[PDB]
Amino acid sequence: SIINFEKLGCGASIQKTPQIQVYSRHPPENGKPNILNCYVTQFHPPHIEIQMLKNGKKIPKVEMSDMSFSKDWSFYILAHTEFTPTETDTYACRVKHASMAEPKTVYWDRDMGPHSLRYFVTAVSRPGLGEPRYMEVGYVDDTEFVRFDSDAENPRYEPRARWMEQEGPEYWERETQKAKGNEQSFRVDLRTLLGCYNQSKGGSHTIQVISGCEVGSDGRLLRGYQQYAYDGCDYIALNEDLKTWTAADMAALITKHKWEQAGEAERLRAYLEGTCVEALRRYLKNGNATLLRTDSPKAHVTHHSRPEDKVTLRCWALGFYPADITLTWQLNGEELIQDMELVETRPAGDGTFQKWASVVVPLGKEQYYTCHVYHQGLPEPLTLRWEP
């Protein structure tokens, strides 16, 4: 259960460039259906235009995941489309974003315990296009389990996990009405932050919040979060003592003063130690059948013939959950950490993740190199080599 926010009340009177990966869900085999993914990350502002292209032409039915953001405030989103790869068809992803002067086109290259309850809140103004878009997204660990999205005629909280369907109507009604009240606070804060930052009246701006708690197996609060950002930059945050505020900016000092006088840190500490812990306990219980499950990576090495007497070995980890993983290459028992190439871990689109790490090695020396895969789901680390 998310907190009821208090207005920031800053008083009366920033671009990040997207990173893009294009890759298939399953290893491509010509003639057999697959999914092509376009994973776009690390961008701010959240407005973005993603097209997928086949032989230079816009692909019609392209699915878009809901947009999320990470702890560094940057947004991410997965686009995908059904496709059957052929030997000669070219695919690409084209991304248009205010950080870039021209659209970016990225071509598909066949060589491709404690628990936490956190709410990720986004409010984005859209002047001349409608009311601000407001979203509340709840996660137990990294599992999204509830979502409120204002961009609907009769918006309301919806379960994003089957185990939340147990909750009765009184729960959904309470959460929905609280979200609609929260939406109003952020609408007002968006208006007043314009003046506090001496900004023009016609641009889109964003408020982001991370709010929640991390709780140990003994049921004691390990960490509480109440962090705000404006236009992708830190604004104010509750300190680990749950008593004082860090204001990252001159504008936020006005909020800090008001919240001190109003005792907002004590209201937060009570929510965190009370409602937040109790809700997490409740959600962990109903989600017990699925929330603790892990999927171990399946790994294999591919071989790619490079210029002259060098080859690339690529160590793949597929189908794993959660996303945290480590891949290393070894020669003679030493880790080649500085000569590897890696990709950022990326969703397959079915709930599991992919990653690979490659090293360039002398032709004929491939058997001297070992890839190592470290994941919490494995009994012990995987060790593998290239096999013709």
Numbering used by the authors: 1 to 13, 24 to 122, 143 to 418
Paper excerpt:
Major histocompatibility complex class I (MHC I)3 molecules present a diverse array of antigenic peptides, the so-called immunopeptidome, to circulating cytotoxic T lymphocytes. Here, endoplasmic reticulum aminopeptidase 1 (ERAP1) and ERAP2 trim peptides to the optimal length for stable MHC I binding in the final editing step of the antigen processing pathway. The construct consists of SL8 peptide linked with β2m and Kb HC in which the C terminus of SL8 is tethered to the Kb-binding groove through a disulfide bond between Y84C of Kb and a second cysteine within the peptide-β2m linker.
Based on an examination of the native structure of the SIINFEKL (SL8)/Kb pMHC I complex, and the structure of the single-chain SL8-β2m-Kb HC trimer, we introduced alanine substitutions at residues 63, 66, and 167 in the MHC I HC which interact with the bound peptide in the A-pocket. Positions Glu63 and Lys66 interact directly with S(P1) and I(P2) of SL8, whereas Trp167 caps off the N terminus amino group of the peptide. For the W167A-SCT variant the structure and H-bonding network around S(P1) and I(P2) remain very similar to WT-SCT, whereas the space created by the missing Trp167 indole ring is filled by three water molecules. Interestingly, the side chain of N(P4) adopted similar orientation in K66A-SCT, whereas two alternative rotamer states of the N(P4) side chain were resolved in W167A-SCT. Expression of WT (*002) ERAP1 (25) in SCT transfected HeLa E1KO resulted in a significant decrease in the levels of all A-pocket variants detected by 25-D1.16 (∼35–40%). The peptide in both E63A- and K66A-SCT displayed low RMSDCα values (<1.0 Å), whereas SL8 in W167A-SCT deviated more from the initial position, with RMSDCα of ∼2.0 Å. Partial dissociation of the N-terminal portion of the peptide was observed, however complete dissociation did not occur at this timescale even when the anchor residue F(P5), initially buried inside the binding groove, turned toward the solvent-exposed face of the groove, indicating the strong and preferential binding of the peptide C terminus. In particular, E63A-SCT exhibited the lowest free energy profile, followed by W167A-SCT, both of which displayed the lowest energy barriers at the midpoints of the dissociation path.
